[PDB]
Amino acid sequence: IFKPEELRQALMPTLEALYRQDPESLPFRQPVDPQLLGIPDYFDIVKNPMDLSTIKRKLDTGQYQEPWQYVDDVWLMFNNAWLYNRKTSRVYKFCSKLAEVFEQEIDPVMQSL
Numbered sequence: 518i519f520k521p522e523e524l525r526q527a528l529m530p531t532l533e534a535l536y537r538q539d540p541e542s543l544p545f546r547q548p549v550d551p552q553l554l555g556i557p558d559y560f561d562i563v564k565n566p567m568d569l570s571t572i573k574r575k576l577d578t579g580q581y582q583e584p585w586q587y588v589d590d591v592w593l594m595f596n597n598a599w600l601y602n603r604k605t606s607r608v609y610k611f612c613s614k615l616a617e618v619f620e621q622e623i624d625p626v627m628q629s630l
């Protein structure tokens with residue numbers, strides 16, 4: 518029961534808050550490229566990759582029709598990083614801050630929707 522443009526306007530500020538965390542968004546702004554990074558094991562562990570640029574493109578092109586599909590992609594992003602990376606790593610620690618930021622902000626948006 519959502520217009521494509523009202524859903525986008527509602528959820529976009531939540532994505533921007535993730536993207537604007539500096540430095541914590543930096544490992545998440547682009548899809549992981551195992552070839553470029555030289556980590557051939559990546560897609561053996563992460564079957565369904567996700568990142569902030571992919572989420573933005575989906576929010577911009579009507580690929581979310583209910584709020585929970587957007588929320589699922591954000592958690593797929595967090596959970597991929599928490600599965601592949603060491604708990605002490607920059608990526609894991611940065612993921613944990615992005616999740617805090619998401620949690621602290623997503624509740625009213627989902628209430629208003």
Ligand SMILES: CC(=O)N1CC[C@@H](C(=O)O)C1
Nearest residue numbers: 544549554597598601608
């Ligand atoms: C966000 C994430 O899970 N990543 C795994 C490898 C790390 C990197 O090496 O860039 C990025």
